[PDB]
Design a protein around this ligand. Structure first.
Ligand SMILES: CCCCCCCCCCCCCCCCCC(=O)OC[C@H](COP(=O)(O)OCCN)OC(=O)CCCCCCCCCCCCCCCCC
Ligand SMILES: CCCCCCCCCCCCCCCCCC(=O)OC[C@H](COP(=O)(O)OCCN)OC(=O)CCCCCCCCCCCCCCCCC
Ligand SMILES: CC(C)CCC[C@@H](C)[C@H]1CC[C@H]2[C@@H]3CC=C4C[C@@H](OC(=O)CCC(=O)O)CC[C@]4(C)[C@H]3CC[C@]12C
Ligand SMILES: CC(C)CCC[C@@H](C)[C@H]1CC[C@H]2[C@@H]3CC=C4C[C@@H](OC(=O)CCC(=O)O)CC[C@]4(C)[C@H]3CC[C@]12C
Ligand SMILES: CC(C)CCC[C@@H](C)[C@H]1CC[C@H]2[C@@H]3CC=C4C[C@@H](OC(=O)CCC(=O)O)CC[C@]4(C)[C@H]3CC[C@]12C
Ligand SMILES: CC(C)CCC[C@@H](C)[C@H]1CC[C@H]2[C@@H]3CC=C4C[C@@H](OC(=O)CCC(=O)O)CC[C@]4(C)[C@H]3CC[C@]12C
Ligand SMILES: CC(C)CCC[C@@H](C)[C@H]1CC[C@H]2[C@@H]3CC=C4C[C@@H](OC(=O)CCC(=O)O)CC[C@]4(C)[C@H]3CC[C@]12C
Ligand SMILES: CC(C)CCC[C@@H](C)[C@H]1CC[C@H]2[C@@H]3CC=C4C[C@@H](OC(=O)CCC(=O)O)CC[C@]4(C)[C@H]3CC[C@]12C
Ligand SMILES: CC1(C)O[C@@H]2[C@@H](CO[C@@]3(COS(N)(=O)=O)OC(C)(C)O[C@@H]23)O1
Ligand SMILES: CCCCCCCCCCCCCCCC
Ligand SMILES: CCCCCCCCCCCCCCCC
Ligand SMILES: [Ca+2]
Lengths: 72, 136, 70, 535, 162, 72
């Protein structure tokens, strides 16, 4: 009964390969905008642009945006 | 019915019959339907004339040992439960079956007339069924 | 202990269910008014209220009594 | 920490509720190295927190479809649809009342004018001034505004008094409370009188219930075709109100029970040497408003840490991580099954109510006075209830598919810019790539405009921005006020290069259009949302 | 008669303001929209008793002037009540296809006629059992504009036919 | 929670806070939640669920006689 749910709901993820390409494209667009605009803020451990949370790199900005999406 | 009930048919087939395209005659029918849960029909508590009047709605041709096919019976249960293009008998049910065959080709063209004829077994009025045996 | 002639089942009725409904509201208000102080300390009002718990306990054991005998 | 299994199934439960999962990710990045940890905490959030919301929404929506069709529910819905039929024909019949010293001499022209289509619009264009007057107040508003708006509250209040009495003394108090917003306007008027008096006798707090008149702007919907979709929603809400109130009341009882339980466990134990936190459990109004946090589930983390160090620490005290788990689970999920049942029920009702207007006024009378885009939910529930010459050789099978590769390479080259090191090696290499990419894009935009004349506006904007930035950076770069930022900002337009794929890929375009049509579906409610949020 | 006389009926007993206002609204439409071809006349006598028969000649002579004459009769609310006379009127049935809206309309009109609800309901219900063919035109559709259009259509067809 | 903390600790215009003063301004923050995060957001989820059209259906009126449960 767990397996039937998992199969059923993963199949329908395999039938929407473009619905989760629009979300990847949203994340990409906003990560690039972030790198351009907030990429050179000086990191300050007192603020929330830390060594952990910064727009300094593509993957750092991707992590920042995922952190925000998950409401953090 | 969705396919959720429909795979129980494979289990009861493999265990109670092991037919491999035939090897049922008719005993397996009421050896099948008279026990398993009733989204497919009879069930345990209904081995009566209610079962009789269900079977008289299912009609389908015969084979070497008075046997029948796997998927022919599959569609038999499916349509007798969901009411998918079935009449009360006669050439009426065969013309409804012609409608059904047209619909099946309309959905699936990839079905060869071997398999397609298997899915539309074409029980003509002259050809007696495994349904109209214990009924009459 | 199956003694018939209850006469208590007719007390389970229109008015004594609308008084229990009010004792429960009063009790919830009393539980709302309470304040919890850190280490065995008690406000004056909480000491004042701790002298109503027997009333509510009395009414509720009375409800158990009448429902059980009826 | 992940020490026991019980400390790990609690840290991971915290991360799945998405509260403070990045602090855990950052701790393990520091303690082990930041290369592999993202593989544990991203799929823990994607699988455990998003995918499980998807499962829960799906399961509940299936249950709501299967429960709307039970006999005892179809019955209570037909009882609503019939009464809507009664009122719908009854109002039409009440239109037949068209009858044509001062008891009849002036009180004949009042009720005439005070229902004319110019009167509704005067009132609705003056309430829209009222709600623009009380929306410009701010802090330190210039001293003339304070007095101007001071006169304005009285002016508008008196004016609404007049144009309310003209409906009451001019049309009749007995038959006055027979229109819902007429009762509402009377209520808002009396409330504004309350507010005036209470401001007079207690200057200070002025919570000002006169912006509520902005609700009348919803009457504007009457002039559109979206009126039925919304009046039916309000009808289905107002019918099922003894069962929405008796259900918010059960949410309130269980919040009260959990507030009292938290007072028992943690009452007065929160007086730490730092100072008692604001998320207390000492008194009742402060226990209610921390059980509310834990339900809305936001920073239940910190409350649990306080409630653990309250009863000990990571020590005899961790048995009380079980009040904050049984209240952040059975709260984040019983409050989406309550508020989704309410909103799916009362909105499938208003969708089937409005499907039986167009199925009568547009299919019964229009015949007897002489599927079809049915959604997935509607299909399923009905099934349940039943039980120039040269350039045209642009097309080469390798032009609309070879530009797609350039779009992909340009998008990827966007990712590799160093934001900080303005003049490093990479940024120069990518600037040369920028020349290449704008060259390709213009050499294809021009030929397309040749074959097409005069989604493409996106291509145009990007190429124009690229050309302008290149021109005015190559030309001088100086002698214009602070125009390094000008090139830096017209290079943000480059980020639109990925967007160009949407029109190219016929299925990405289809998913994008599905998103847009969903946005248009929720747009008569997005505006009601914006209006309430403004209030 | 040269042209069939006009009588409308169906809500309830004429003399109760519900039926009064309904018939008056449609008659006033007939006037204002067709002002210059039709004349409305008022009858306070019992035509089922045909002073009683002195008015039928007047009815004939208005009908003999090649202009439509609608009757504001004040006693007839049945199709069977006028199954004997030779007038042969065009009968319009102002129907209400559901009772509950009727009783809500009745209580809706102030209070006094709420002292007549029970008995008016009997007449309306019995009208619902009267034969349909006994009526030339059915008027039940909720709106005034559409019912007025329906009457305009039928009577313009009548006027073109003669 | 921090905005609620600021909103209760509130005294008068151009005066600083006082802890847990005006504790009734928390009513504004529950009537808010009952309306926007709980009620309208679930109104939106329900409108998007109820009115969701099948993605690709232009095959002779969506298999006019054999549909989802019949067809599959
Ligand atoms: C879908 C679910 C996927 C779940 C994957 C979970 C993997 C979590 C791994 C976290 C590792 C974090 C890190 O950087 O640790 C570095 C660590 C150094 O080693 P150390 O911690 O000193 O322990 C030595 C023990 N002999 O060395 C490590 O621990 C290295 C671990 C490498 C893990 C590679 C995983 C590949 C993808 C697996 C998919 C399944
Ligand atoms: C069914 C599934 C659940 C099964 C539960 C079984 C409970 C068994 C209890 C065994 C008790 C053993 C014991 O006495 O442990 C003492 C120990 C002291 O821990 P201490 O040294 O203070 O700090 C350790 C920090 N890692 O204590 C500990 O190590 C901590 C004990 C509590 C662990 C955290 C529990 C949090 C809530 C988990 C909910 C699930
Ligand atoms: C050691 C404790 C603390 C937890 C151990 C892990 C559990 C989360 C796992 C272990 C065994 C699992 C169970 C093994 C078998 C079943 C029966 C199964 O039920 C059915 O499918 C119903 C029968 C049917 O309709 O076919 C699925 C759930 C459940 C309880 C599984 C749910 C997940 C369980 C409880
Ligand atoms: C930690 C969790 C989230 C990941 C576990 C993996 C699941 C996403 C996958 C892995 C293997 C899958 C199984 C692989 C094969 C099958 C057989 C297959 O059976 C059928 O098609 C239905 C039954 C039948 O008709 O025979 C689909 C279900 C099942 C059990 C799958 C169910 C989903 C499973 C458990
Ligand atoms: C529902 C899913 C399947 C849709 C498609 C995926 C997207 C939801 C995106 C948005 C958030 C993205 C993630 C955001 C954060 C990261 C961390 C990032 O980390 C690193 O490359 C280095 C380490 C570090 O982050 O510091 C790698 C990409 C990844 C996994 C991203 C992968 C793609 C994700 C999951
Ligand atoms: C038609 C209705 C629904 C909306 C009308 C819009 C106004 C309600 C908004 C539009 C822009 C807003 C303004 C944007 C900026 C400012 C400046 C700012 O005030 C100051 O600069 C503080 C010092 C000073 O008052 O001089 C805050 C108030 C104000 C006028 C805002 C007040 C509210 C305004 C006028
Ligand atoms: C991950 C890739 C395979 C996706 C598809 C895109 C690639 C075909 C190209 C397009 C632009 C290329 C980039 C263009 C310029 C550069 C700068 C070039 O020079 C340096 O950065 C060297 C620095 C050093 O020596 O450390 C290194 C490769 C890189 C990042 C290229 C990496 C490969 C990219 C992304
Ligand atoms: C537009 C729709 C959603 C109607 C629902 C909105 C109102 C009915 C709500 C919005 C916020 C609520 C207010 C927010 C907070 C307060 C402050 C609270 O304290 C006071 O201001 C009174 C005592 C004082 O501070 O002196 C009294 C209730 C009140 C006005 C609430 C009463 C109900 C209000 C006006
Ligand atoms: C399955 C679904 C959608 O949720 C159930 C059940 C019956 O109706 C509910 C819906 O809440 S409400 N008050 O809008 O009618 O009302 C109650 C009686 C609360 O139960 C609701 O329908
Ligand atoms: C007869 C009333 C017509 C109203 C037209 C606009 C209605 C818009 C939807 C109202 C939803 C109210 C929800 C309030 C928060 C619980
Ligand atoms: C769900 C409705 C109840 C909300 C409870 C929080 C607000 C409490 C308002 C009254 C506060 C009185 C404070 C007295 C001193 C602590
Ligand atoms: Ca958070």
């Amino acid at each position: 009964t767990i397996r039937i749910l998992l199969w059923t709901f993963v199949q329908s993820f395999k039938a929407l390969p473009y619905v989760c390409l629009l979300i990847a494209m949203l994340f990409f667009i906003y990560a690039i905008i972030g790198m351009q605009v907030f990429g050179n803020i000086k990191l300050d451990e007192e603020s929330h642009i830390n060594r952990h949370n910064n727009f300094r790199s593509f993957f750092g900005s991707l992590m920042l945006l995922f952190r925000s999406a998950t409401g953090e | 019915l969705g396919p959720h009930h429909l795979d129980e048919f494979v289990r009861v087939w493999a265990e109670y019959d092991r037919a491999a395209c035939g090897r049922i005659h008719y005993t397996e029918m009421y050896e099948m339907l008279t026990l398993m849960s009733p989204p497919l029909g009879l069930g345990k508590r209904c081995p009566s004339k209610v079962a009789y009047k269900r079977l008289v709605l299912m009609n389908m041709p015969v084979a070497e040992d008075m046997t029948v096919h796997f998927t022919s019976t599959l569609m038999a249960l499916i349509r007798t439960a969901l009411d998918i293009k079935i009449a009360k008998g006669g050439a009426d049910r065969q013309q409804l079956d012609s409608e059904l065959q047209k619909e099946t080709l309309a959905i699936w063209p990839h079905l060869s007339q071997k398999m397609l004829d298997l899915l539309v077994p074409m029980p003509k009025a002259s050809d007696l069924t495994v349904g109209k045996i214990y009924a009459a | 202990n199956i003694v018939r002639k209850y006469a208590k089942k007719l007390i389970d009725w229109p008015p004594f269910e609308y008084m229990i409904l009010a004792t429960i509201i009063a009790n919830c208000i009393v539980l709302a008014l309470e304040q919890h102080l850190p280490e065995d300390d008690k406000t004056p009002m909480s000491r004042r209220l701790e002298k109503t718990e027997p009333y509510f306990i009395g009414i509720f054991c009375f409800e158990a009594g009448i429902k059980i005998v009826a | 920490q992940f020490d026991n299994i019980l400390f790990a199934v609690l840290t991971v439960f915290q991360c799945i509720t998405m509260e403070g999962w990045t602090t855990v990710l950052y701790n393990t990045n520091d303690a082990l190295g930041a290369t592999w940890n993202w593989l544990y905490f991203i799929p823990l959030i994607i699988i455990g927190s998003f995918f499980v919301l998807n499962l829960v929404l799906g399961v509940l929506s299936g249950e709501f479809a299967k429960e709307r069709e039970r006999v005892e529910n179809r019955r209570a819905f037909m009882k609503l649809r019939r009464q809507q039929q009664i009122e719908r024909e009854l109002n039409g019949y009440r239109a037949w009342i068209d009858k044509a010293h001062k008891e009849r001499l002036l009180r004949i022209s009042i009720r005439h004018m005070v229902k004319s289509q110019v009167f509704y619009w005067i009132v609705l264009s003056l309430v829209a001034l009222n709600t623009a007057c009380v929306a410009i107040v701010h802090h330190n508003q210039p001293q003339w505004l304070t007095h101007l708006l001071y006169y304005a509250e009285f002016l508008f209040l008196g004016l609404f008094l007049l144009e309310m009495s003209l409906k009451m003394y001019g049309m009749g108090p007995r038959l006055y409370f027979h229109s819902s917003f007429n009762c509402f306007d009377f209520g808002v008027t009396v409330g504004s009188i309350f507010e005036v008096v209470w401001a007079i006798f207690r200057p200070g707090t002025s919570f000002g219930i006169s912006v509520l008149r902005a609700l009348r702007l919803l009457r504007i919907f009457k002039i559109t075709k979206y009126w039925a979709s919304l009046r039916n929603l309000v009808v289905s809400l107002m019918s099922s109100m003894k069962s929405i109130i008796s259900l918010l009341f059960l949410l309130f009882l269980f919040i009260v029970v959990f507030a009292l339980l938290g007072m028992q466990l943690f009452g007065g134990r929160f007086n730490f040497n730092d100072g008692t936190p604001s998320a207390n459990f000492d008194t009742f109004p402060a226990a209610i408003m921390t059980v509310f946090q834990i339900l809305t589930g936001e920073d239940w983390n910190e409350v649990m840490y306080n409630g653990i160090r309250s009863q000990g620490g990571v020590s005899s005290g961790m048995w009380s991580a079980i009040y904050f788990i049984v209240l952040t689970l059975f709260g984040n999920y019983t409050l989406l099954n309550v508020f989704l049942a309410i909103a799916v029920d009362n909105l499938a009702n208003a969708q089937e109510l409005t499907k039986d207007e167009q199925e009568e006024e547009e299919a019964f009378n229009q015949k007897h006075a002489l599927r079809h885009h049915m959604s997935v939910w509607e299909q399923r529930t009905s099934q349940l209830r039943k039980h120039r010459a040269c350039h045209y050789i642009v097309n080469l099978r390798y032009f609309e598919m070879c530009i797609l590769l350039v779009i992909a390479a340009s998008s990827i080259a966007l990712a590799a810019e160093d934001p900080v090191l303005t003049n490093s090696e990479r940024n120069k290499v990518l600037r040369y790539f920028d020349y290449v990419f704008t060259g390709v894009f213009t050499f294809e935009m021009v030929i397309k405009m040749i074959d097409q004349g005069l989604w493409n506006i996106l291509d145009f904007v990007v190429v124009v921005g690229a050309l302008v930035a290149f021109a005015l950076a190559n030309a001088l770069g100086t002698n214009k006020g602070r125009d390094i930022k000008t090139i830096k900002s017209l290079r943000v337009l480059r980020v639109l290069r990925p967007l160009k794929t949407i029109k190219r890929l016929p299925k990405l375009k289809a998913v994008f259009d599905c998103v847009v049509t969903s946005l248009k579906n929720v747009f008569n409610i997005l505006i009601v949302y914006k209006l309430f949020m403004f209030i | 008669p040269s042209m069939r006389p006009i009588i409308l009926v169906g809500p309830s007993l004429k003399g109760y303001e519900v039926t009064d206002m309904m018939q008056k609204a449609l008659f006033d439409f007939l006037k204002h929209r067709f002002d210059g071809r039709i004349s409305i006349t008022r009858v306070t006598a019992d035509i089922s008793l045909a002073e009683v028969q002195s008015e039928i000649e007047r009815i004939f002579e208005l009908a003999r002037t090649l202009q439509l004459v609608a009757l504001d009769a004040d006693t007839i609310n049945h199709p069977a009540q006028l199954s004997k006379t030779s007038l042969a009127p065009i009968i319009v049935y102002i129907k209400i296809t559901s009772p509950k809206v009727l009783q809500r309309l009745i209580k809706s009109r102030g209070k006094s006629q709420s002292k007549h609800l029970n008995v008016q309901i009997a007449a309306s219900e019995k009208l619902a059992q009267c034969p349909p063919e006994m009526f030339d035109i059915i008027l039940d559709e909720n709106q005034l504009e559409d019912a007025c259009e329906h009457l305009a259509e039928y009577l313009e067809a009548y006027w073109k036919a003669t | 929670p921090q905005v609620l903390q600021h909103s209760v600790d509130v005294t008068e215009e151009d005066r600083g806070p006082s802890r847990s003063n005006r504790m009734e301004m928390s009513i504004f923050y529950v009537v808010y939640f009952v309306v926007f995060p709980f009620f309208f957001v679930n109104i939106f989820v329900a409108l998007i669920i109820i009115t969701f059209q099948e993605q690709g259906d232009k095959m002779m009126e969506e298999c006019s006689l054999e549909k989802n449960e019949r067809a599959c």
